[PDB]
Design an enzyme around this catalytic site. Structure first.
Site, short mmCIF file in Angstrom:
data_model
loop_
_atom_site.label_atom_id
_atom_site.label_comp_id
_atom_site.label_asym_id
_atom_site.label_seq_id
_atom_site.Cartn_x
_atom_site.Cartn_y
_atom_site.Cartn_z
CB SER A 189 -0.96 0.00 1.19
OG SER A 189 -1.94 -1.02 1.04
CE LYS B 132 -4.49 1.55 -1.11
NZ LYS B 132 -3.68 0.32 -0.89
CB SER C 51 -4.64 0.96 3.22
OG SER C 51 -3.62 1.73 3.80
NE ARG D 157 1.99 -1.06 9.83
CZ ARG D 157 0.90 -1.04 9.06
NH1 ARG D 157 1.00 -1.36 7.77
NH2 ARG D 157 -0.28 -0.71 9.57
O1 LIG Z 1 -2.52 -1.16 8.55
C1 LIG Z 1 -3.43 -0.55 7.95
O2 LIG Z 1 -3.53 0.70 7.87
C2 LIG Z 1 -4.49 -1.38 7.26
C3 LIG Z 1 -5.53 -0.78 6.58
C4 LIG Z 1 -6.47 -1.55 5.93
C5 LIG Z 1 -6.38 -2.93 5.95
C6 LIG Z 1 -5.34 -3.56 6.63
C7 LIG Z 1 -5.25 -5.04 6.69
C8 LIG Z 1 -5.22 -5.80 5.52
C9 LIG Z 1 -5.17 -7.18 5.57
C10 LIG Z 1 -5.15 -7.83 6.79
C11 LIG Z 1 -5.18 -7.09 7.96
O3 LIG Z 1 -5.17 -7.72 9.17
C12 LIG Z 1 -5.22 -5.70 7.92
C13 LIG Z 1 -4.40 -2.77 7.28
#
Ligand SMILES: O=C(O)c1cccc(-c2cccc(O)c2)c1
Ligand SMILES: [Cl-]
Length: 242
Positions: free
Chosen positions: A47, A50, A95, A227
């Site tokens: 992502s 993006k 995302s 993160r």
């Molecule tokens: O970390 C994020 O900002 C985020 C935003 C949207 C979806 C996800 C995500 C996508 C797949 C599996 C999961 O557990 C989380 C993470």
């Protein structure tokens, strides 16, 4: 120009993990990292892609502006925030993969490839499906390459309009207070080993900017909050933020 401090590995190993943080002091033109090797290892962008995808969509007119509504296609997905209408701001914030998959299909293979070459973005390789190559195709980018790309965006030096770059930097807004502003994008790559999380962006201060790019091992989604938390703890330790 570049300094390696292996003691910073503790930020990751204390969480039973491994990763790299790369910092770039714009005023001093100096870089810092815990691991020069991993700073230059190339991963799927997931992502974090993006950012370039948004720039290309805006500059080609696929996206009119940051208010244009992308209607939910009515397909229930497992991420609740994806099952709603979005604009560029909220699509970035949450995302929202399926919105950006449609951007990529309208951009098309030829224009996507040419624009990534113009951006000098990673290995510039879109091999795979046009609507998923940043998740399971051939494109790869390193932490140091992310910084190089972000520096161009900050200075409006990418080969798209100033307007397109300003809109994307607005959409990257993540945090702001009386002490600093962070513009950034997270990433989470699971379809190709090793699974990693990304956070890339920069910190704006009154009189300087610090660019950053980090990735870390991410065997499960339980560690995704690390993160941002680890990055901000590095920034605090180096007295970039309070
Ligand atoms: O970390 C994020 O900002 C985020 C935003 C949207 C979806 C996800 C995500 C996508 C797949 C599996 C999961 O557990 C989380 C993470
Ligand atoms: Cl802004």
């Amino acid at each position: 120009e570049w300094q390696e401090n292996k003691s910073w590995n503790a930020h990751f190993t204390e969480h039973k993990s491994q990763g790299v943080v790369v910092l770039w002091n714009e005023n001093k033109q100096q870089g810092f990292t815990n691991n020069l090797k991993r700073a230059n290892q190339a991963f799927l962008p997931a992502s974090t892609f993006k950012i370039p995808n948004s720039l290309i969509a805006l500059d080609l007119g696929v996206v009119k502006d940051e208010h244009q509504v992308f209607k939910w296609d009515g397909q229930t997905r497992d991420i609740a925030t994806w099952n709603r209408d979005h604009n560029l701001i909220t699509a970035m914030k949450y995302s929202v993969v399926p919105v950006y998959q449609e951007f990529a299909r309208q951009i098309g293979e030829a224009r996507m490839s040419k624009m990534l070459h113009a951006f000098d973005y990673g290995n510039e390789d879109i091999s795979g499906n046009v609507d998923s190559f940043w998740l399971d195709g051939g494109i790869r980018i390193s932490a140091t390459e992310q910084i190089s790309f972000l520096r161009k965006l900050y200075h409006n030096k990418l080969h798209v309009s100033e307007r397109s770059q300003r809109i994307v930097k607005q959409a990257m807004l993540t945090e702001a207070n009386g002490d600093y502003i962070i513009r950034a994008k997270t990433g989470y790559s699971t379809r190709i080993e090793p699974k990693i999380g990304w956070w890339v962006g920069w910190v704006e201060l009154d009189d300087n900017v610090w660019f950053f790019a980090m990735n870390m091992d991410m065997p499960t989604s339980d560690g995704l909050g690390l993160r941002q938390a680890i990055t901000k703890e590095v920034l605090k330790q180096e007295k970039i933020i309070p």
